């Protein structure tokens, strides 16, 4: 049996920053989801469109594993219909999103006493994002009416999360994996057992 590499997605040593979230395609494999919905390691596990008791035996053309690191307090923004700094400028899910949002506390992996500033998020943008878009430009953001000229009310659009082991839970890092599912006119390639 050719099993889908959910292990590799969830056990990755490094996750992308939310401003530049990663995407991996899962196809032409057997998707065993029993390893995801039967564990207590996740703090968040919520599916939209398809029930966890049904997706286990449904066939799809693609499963997209989108992954990133955000603050625990911002986990609630990773949902259809949501708004906020992450939902609007970093990672937008469509109102008709089908798939599962899975997240867990990674305070023992992604934070340091001296401050782990290697995880960035977009703080400013001229407008919000299209669902599943990605914007990794670093063009200086002009907040006011004064031209930035590439360099007051002009900001480097990204900011770091000061992730530290002593932060309270809402300020601890969370690893988020969003499995977006779709069925196209194309023949399905990803079936469960």
């Amino acid at each position, epitope marked *: 049996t050719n099993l889908c590499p959910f292990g590799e997605v969830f056990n990755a040593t490094r996750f992308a920053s939310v401003y530049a979230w990663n995407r991996k395609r899962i196809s032409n494999c057997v998707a065993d989801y029993s390893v995801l919905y*039967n564990s*207590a390691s996740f*703090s968040t*596990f*919520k599916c939209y469109g398809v029930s966890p008791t049904k997706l286990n035996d449904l066939c799809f053309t693609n499963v997209y594993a989108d992954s990133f690191v955000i603050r625990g307090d911002e*986990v609630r923004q990773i949902a259809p219909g949501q708004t906020g700094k992450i939902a609007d400028y970093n990672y937008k899910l469509p109102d008709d999103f089908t798939g599962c949002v899975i997240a867990w506390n990674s305070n023992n992996l992604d934070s340091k006493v001296g401050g782990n500033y290697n995880y960035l998020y977009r703080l400013f943008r001229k407008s919000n994002l299209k669902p599943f878009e990605r914007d990794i430009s670093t063009e200086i953001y002009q907040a006011g009416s004064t031209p930035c000229n590439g360099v007051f009310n002009c900001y480097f659009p990204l900011q770091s999360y000061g992730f530290q082991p002593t932060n309270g839970v809402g300020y601890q890092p969370y690893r988020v994996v969003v499995l977006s599912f779709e069925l196209l006119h194309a023949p399905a390639t990803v079936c469960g057992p």
Partner: antibody
Amino acid sequence: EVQLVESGGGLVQPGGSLRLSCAASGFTFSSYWMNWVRQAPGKGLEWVANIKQDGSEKYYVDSVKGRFTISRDNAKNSLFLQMNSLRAEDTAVYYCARVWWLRGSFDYWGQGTLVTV
Amino acid sequence: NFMLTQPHSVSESPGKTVTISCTGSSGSIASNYVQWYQQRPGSAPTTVIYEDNQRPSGVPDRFSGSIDSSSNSASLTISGLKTEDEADYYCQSYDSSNHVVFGGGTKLTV
């Protein structure tokens, strides 16, 4: 048609022990999680213990750690709960319940075993 | 620790509607699924609503519900109360900090 049949309750002295069990029929244990849910007289429900399909992993409410042990025999279609060092706090009816997946619903409940201290 | 709370006493005349809330505390109710149970006095609780807003076969369509992320709360509503709908209703959700959390329970009369 599924049924959960509890037994092994009754009175128990403070500081003692009793083994509760819950026989099942109509379904296979290999496909379900089993849980115990406690209901003190006149109060709402609270969760006590959880065992997964293979018996390889167990969870408990923190308030019973070191006092309760959950186990299951897939061949005998019987769930067990061994509870030691009971206190007055522990008087309750104990329901066993079937859960399809960990974070999902408890879609079938037994009638409940009365345990008093 | 994450916990759910509920109104103790809820009631309304038959034929009218009722809302039974469940609010989160020191955690997000919307991060997991919310279940609702109905326990008639004298017997075991059964599922009425599960996975936020749906219901198992055997449950009439007068029982519905939703989760309001912005209020960190969830609720079920009953329309067209029947005198049959006399029970203690409970909300339930899962957390990693504390595995299964049941709400206090709402005593509903008609």
